[PDB]
């Protein structure tokens, strides 16, 4: 009878809300800010840790730390602060009356899931809890039962194929190349034009520039020749203190790392080759059904050139007699949370919650038996 | 057949000479001095700009300007004056008969290199020219083919790892903290004892004090307690007009900014953490070979405590089963020029000069294709 909570804890954004809703109620950056100076003015209330948007509005006097890197929680006190801010200050609910659904990237360490279960049952003690795979939630929100999901966020880009409700665990691929690597590469290549960004607040500024101005080129060499020929692709951005910068080919050289990882010195293949290799590792009789049901999700897949480029690359890789379709919904930045709300509101899901007596009987190892 | 010229244009010192020599022939401070008063005595020759040592000998009536800051040329007329003084008054050669080798810091703006190419091909028009990376020249002068070079001069402290003659461009780190920042911090902390230095000549005096008297503490807290306990670390310095000043803990609080940048309000990590992060960003199988081949170069690394402190900090950071060696040659103040002389005298280097017809055909953009 009680409303369940869905909390997608990504590497760069935390999205929390209630089950059965269409959009997440609380979306905030998952950062913890700490002051690096001394407060000489007394009388007003100054805290030691700033969490979320308050860290973003005061980032000029704070050092910002991300508790999650590549889908792995590194700082657990900061992660506890993020969860406390999500439960009490944003959602404004008591966590002991609502079951909570959490997400996790595939091929993750087991200790991350075990400590997540331990913290949810011992610090914010819930009646029930569950850990789900984000690509399965993206396929839940897509409304279909078959397809291969490429989910790319802030730390993890992973491909998961599912045929007729059955997952293929040997064909699941994980690549540690996502939007934070693109932000770092943009910060590296912005020094060619004479712009220097070194701090964490400057990293947030570069992330805003990447969100506002970058796009995926259909043909990389033709666009590089066009940028070298005329200044028609140059765009201007206004800094917070008033300066105006101009960028040219860096609008499309930054998301080209998703298709050419060797720009950042990585031996792995691109996302199109990863998708093709994940399709090739499945059974043959389902492969055509995976060719026409490519589903994109995550904030990294929101560049306004990526669907046509992915379609062209997969059509080049696949045999010519197959139909290639890329499903790119406009709400795919929040599709993991939407699938979490669809899954938690199902009547058949109420019997696979991990309850508190099961955690008391089995310890923090029941999550390896009742989940993926 | 003609002897090439090697000219290392640092942020604080210009070192020029001939290829194949062991030491640079002309080492002079890269400053331009201009008079701030009116010359009331007529008859003798007073000039408008004093370049080099003549600026240092008459600095009490001149305002001194550095044309290079943080390895970036800001004033180009003053840079042209510096190059003219280096070619005609110091080396005493015609620049149109000798190819010239120049150095540059990594992760620099492209317009700097392009304007250097344009100036050396159109004002001091050379048969050939080349731009090299200073840490690669330091590894050339070291005599080995593998290792990670930490080069710290007057504007730039950069780490470059090279394994078996192959550079690792994604692990190259640049930090804008060097000896001029140490001079400014020494000026700031010299006001505690009652000494005031505000002018540019006083900046040169404080730089001389820092060169003569400062050293790197092995343990900062123990040395601070020892300085607070007894006056055994105090040293005396004689000013040019006859006053004698005495300094205590400021002998080791000034180069501590290299290991703790937060003394000058900078969010970056120390040089030891930068070196460790540059090592850990490389491949694993080469990391041991980067642990025993740490090469120091530049005038900033000439403090008489820095090798032991760097060894202790890196040994604390690294796993205990690895061997840590810091290579600190006594001639490392001029090692970039020595490597430039080694490189320019090689028989295999004569085919990668940027010639004048190539500059005429391709304009001032050939330097991005024939160099780093």
């Amino acid at each position: 009878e009680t409303t369940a909570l869905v909390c997608d804890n990504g590497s760069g954004l935390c999205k929390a809300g209630f089950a059965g809703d269409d959009a997440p109620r609380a979306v905030f950056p998952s950062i913890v800010g700490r002051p690096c100076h001394q407060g000489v003015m007394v009388g007003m209330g100054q805290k030691d840790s700033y969490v979320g948007d308050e860290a973003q509005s005061k980032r000029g006097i704070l050092t910002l730390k991300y508790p999650i890197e590549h889908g792995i929680i590194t700082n657990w006190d900061d992660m506890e602060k993020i969860w406390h801010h999500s439960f009490y200050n944003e959602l404004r609910v008591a966590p002991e009356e609502h079951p909570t659904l959490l997400t996790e990237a595939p091929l993750n360490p087991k200790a991350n899931r075990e400590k997540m279960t331990q913290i949810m049952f011992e610090t914010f003690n819930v009646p029930a809890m569950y850990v789900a795979i984000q690509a399965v939630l993206s396929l839940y929100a897509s409304g279909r039962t078959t397809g291969i999901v490429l989910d790319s966020g802030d730390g993890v880009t992973h491909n998961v194929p599912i045929y007729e409700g059955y997952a293929l665990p040997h064909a699941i691929m994980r690549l540690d190349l996502a939007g934070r690597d693109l932000t770092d590469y943009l910060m590296k290549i912005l020094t060619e034009r004479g712009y220097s960004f070194v701090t964490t607040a400057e990293r947030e500024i570069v992330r805003d520039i990447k969100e506002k101005l970058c796009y995926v080129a259909l043909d990389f060499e033709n666009e590089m020749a066009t940028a070298a020929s005329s200044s028609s692709l140059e765009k201007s951005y206004e800094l917070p203190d008033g300066q105006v910068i101009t960028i040219g080919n860096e609008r499309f050289r930054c998301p080209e790392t998703l298709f050419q990882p060797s720009f950042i010195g990585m031996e792995s293949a691109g996302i199109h080759e990863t998708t093709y290799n994940s399709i090739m590792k499945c059974d043959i009789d389902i492969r055509k059904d995976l060719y026409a049901n490519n589903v994109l999700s995550g904030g990294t897949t929101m560049y306004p050139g990526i669907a046509d480029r992915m379609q062209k690359e997969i059509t080049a890789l696949a045999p010519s007699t197959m139909k290639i379709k890329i499903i790119a919904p406009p709400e795919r930045k929040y599709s993991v949370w939407i699938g979490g709300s669809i899954l938690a509101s199902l009547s058949t899901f109420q019997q696979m919650w991990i309850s508190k007596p099961e955690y008391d009987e089995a310890g923090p190892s029941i999550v390896h038996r009742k989940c993926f | 057949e003609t002897t090439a010229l090697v000219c290392d244009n640092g942020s604080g010192l210009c070192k020029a000479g001939f290829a194949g020599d062991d030491a640079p022939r002309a080492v002079f401070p890269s400053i331009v001095g201009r008079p701030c008063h009116q010359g009331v005595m007529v008859g003798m020759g007073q000039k408008d700009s004093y370049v080099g040592d003549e600026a240092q000998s008459k600095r009490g009536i001149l305002t001194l300007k550095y044309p290079i800051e943080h390895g970036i040329i800001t004033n180009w007329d003053d840079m042209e004056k510096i190059w003219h003084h280096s070619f005609y008054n110091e080396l005493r050669v015609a620049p149109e008969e000798h190819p010239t080798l120049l150095t540059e810091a990594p992760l620099n703006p492209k317009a700097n290199r392009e304007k250097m190419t344009q100036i050396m091909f159109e004002t001091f028009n050379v048969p050939a020219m080349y731009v090299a990376i200073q840490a690669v020249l330091s590894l050339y002068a070291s005599g080995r083919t593998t290792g990670i070079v930490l080069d710290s001069g007057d504007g730039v402290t950069h780490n470059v790892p090279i394994y078996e003659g192959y550079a690792l461009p994604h692990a190259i780190m640049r930090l804008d903290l060097a000896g001029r920042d140490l001079t400014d911090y020494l000026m700031k902390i010299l006001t505690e004892r009652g000494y005031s230095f505000v002018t540019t000549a006083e900046r040169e005096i404080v730089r001389d004090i820092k060169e003569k008297l400062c050293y790197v503490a092995l343990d900062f807290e123990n040395e601070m307690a020892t300085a607070a306990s007894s006056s055994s670390l105090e040293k005396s310095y004689e000013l040019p007009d006859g006053q004698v000043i005495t300094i205590g803990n400021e002998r080791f609080r000034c180069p501590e900014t290299l290991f703790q940048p937060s003394f000058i309000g900078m969010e970056s990590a120390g040089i030891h953490e930068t070196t460790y992060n540059s090592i850990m960003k490389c491949d694993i199988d080469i990391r041991k070979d980067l642990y025993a081949n740490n090469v120091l170069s530049g005038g900033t690394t000439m403090y008489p405590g820095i090798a032991d402190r760097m060894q202790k900090e890196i040994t604390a950071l690294a796993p205990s089963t690895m061997k840590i060696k810091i290579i600190a040659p006594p001639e490392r103040k001029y090692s970039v020029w020595i490597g430039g002389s080694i490189l320019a005298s090689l028989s295999t280097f004569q085919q990668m000069w940027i010639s004048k017809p190539e500059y005429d055909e391709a304009g001032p953009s050939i330097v991005h294709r024939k160099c780093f």
Binding site: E69, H70, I72, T74, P109, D176 | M280, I284
Partner: peptide
């Protein structure tokens, strides 16, 4: 991670 990342 803890053996080839960091994380």
């Amino acid at each position: 991670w803890x053996a080839x990342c960091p994380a």
